[PDB]
Design a protein around this ligand. Structure first.
Ligand SMILES: *[C@@H]1O[C@H](CO)[C@@H](O)[C@H](O)[C@H]1NC(C)=O
Lengths: 220, 210
């Protein structure tokens, strides 16, 4: 069986160069086309280009002047270069194999690399409590949470009581604010009766800034 | 340029149900079409190529047909693992994909539990106030959330986030966050979020006074 593994820097500033590499394990580059496909957040897959022989790449026309795809044949690896990136190049980038006619689909695929292009500076999140209250006791059920705000880049991880509290937990997908910083909430529904006798702590970690926050959430 | 259009954009079907999704090409492409399955955070997986040929390992409940401009992907009886987004792809030319069809799990209508959270005093120190409205465990996905400040409908100062379908009960949860400056928050009294959803007999409003 064959694995495509990808690596390369995924956090970029505008006008820099995206440089990704795909390693092929279990198969040689010989006799096949090797391709790159990207997927903007919430949008469809887009073919970038592919190559079989160095010197004969085939590119998506709108990207030709910025894109280089090349083979490192001694290592069975191939690479993608994309110059002068802007925020619009933010996407998950996949590598894939493409076989000779008449067997043309993409297969196998790499796991993808998340690529974010922004001028935003690395910033750790502020963590605020979403306090439970008696005007949030939905028939014996209270809700509480943590607001994880103004961080860059993704991701953050959130747990509750160090992983002991798992039931009824919803950690929402991050949203990109108009400031260019991400924000997120994590909530949990618990029995109301437990509010006065049980401690609730959200654990928040943002590795890009080495931020670790434990915030106890108390009623009001 | 050849364009691939998939219908429907969104399919809700029960486990055990049959589903057929279509791909229409703007010009004829004979049989140069493939279908992929993609789950969130993951790479696409090849299902069918040359319009009707199954990739090895793919279960027999999958089939495809069509040639020219109209193509079909069919699952004869859905299993939980089949729920995903499906893409069609033109195999030559610009290699363009369709916009995708998301296949979601159908279940009974379930009303949201609604909670509102005032901003913390800690956040007010910083200069911004976030008011959060939570809609918990509902179906279907569609819900209208309106913010009211002193009974005035707000526009352009809130963002929503929705979870993927829960892997067990197939419900959704939704957060709406209203963002105000500290000065703005402190010049008003009543904060309300109003939720409209097929599971509710009438719109539900949760509110607090600052
Ligand atoms: C890709 O671009 C970078 C920076 O522009 C350059 O240093 C490198 O030689 C190019 N090729 C590869 C394989 O990284």
């Amino acid at each position: 069986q064959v694995q495509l593994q990808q690596w390369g820097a995924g956090l970029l500033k505008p006008s820099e160069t995206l440089s990704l590499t795909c390693g092929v394990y279990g198969e040689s580059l010989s006799g096949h086309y090797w391709s790159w496909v990207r997927q903007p957040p919430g949008k469809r897959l887009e073919w970038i280009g592919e190559i079989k022989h160095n010197g004969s790449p085939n590119y998506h026309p709108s990207l030709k002047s910025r894109v280089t795809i090349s083979l490192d044949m001694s290592k069975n690896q191939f690479s993608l270069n994309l110059t002068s990136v802007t925020a619009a190049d933010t996407a998950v980038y996949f590598c894939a194999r493409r076989s000779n006619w008449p067997y043309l689909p993409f297969d196998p695929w790499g796991q993808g690399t998340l690529v974010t292009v922004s001028s935003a500076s690395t910033k750790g999140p502020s963590v605020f409590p979403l306090a439970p209250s008696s005007k949030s006791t939905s028939g014996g059920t209270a809700a509480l949470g943590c607001l994880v705000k103004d961080y860059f880049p993704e991701p953050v991880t959130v747990s509750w009581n160090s992983g002991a509290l798992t039931s009824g937990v919803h950690t929402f997908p991050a949203v990109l604010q108009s400031s260019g910083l991400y924000s997120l909430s994590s909530v949990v529904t618990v029995p109301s009766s437990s509010l006065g006798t049980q401690t609730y702590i959200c654990n928040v970690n943002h590795k890009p800034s080495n931020t670790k926050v434990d915030k106890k959430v108390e009623p009001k | 340029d050849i364009q691939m259009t998939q219908s429907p954009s969104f399919v809700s079907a029960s486990v055990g149900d049959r589903v057929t999704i279509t791909c229409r090409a703007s010009q004829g492409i004979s049989s140069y079409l493939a279908w992929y399955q993609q789950k969130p955070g993951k790479a696409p997986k090849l299902v069918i190529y040359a319009a009707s040929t199954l990739q090895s390992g793919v279960p027999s409940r999958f089939s495809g047909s069509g040639s020219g401009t109209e193509f079909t992907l069919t699952i004869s009886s859905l299993q939980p693992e089949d729920f995903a987004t499906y893409y069609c792809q033109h195999l030559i030319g610009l290699r363009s994909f369709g916009q995708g069809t998301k296949l979601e799990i159908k279940r009974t209508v379930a009303a949201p539990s609604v909670f509102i959270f005032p901003p913390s005093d800690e956040q007010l120190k910083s200069g911004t106030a976030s008011v959060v409205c939570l809609l918990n465990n509902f179906y279907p996905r569609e819900a209208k959330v309106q913010w009211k400040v002193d009974n005035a409908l707000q526009s352009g100062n809130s963002q929503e986030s929705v979870t993927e379908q829960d892997s067990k009960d197939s419900t959704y949860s939704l957060s709406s966050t209203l963002t105000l400056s500290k000065a703005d928050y402190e010049k008003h009294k009543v904060y309300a979020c109003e939720v409209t959803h097929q599971g509710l007999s009438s719109p539900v409003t949760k509110s607090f006074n600052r």
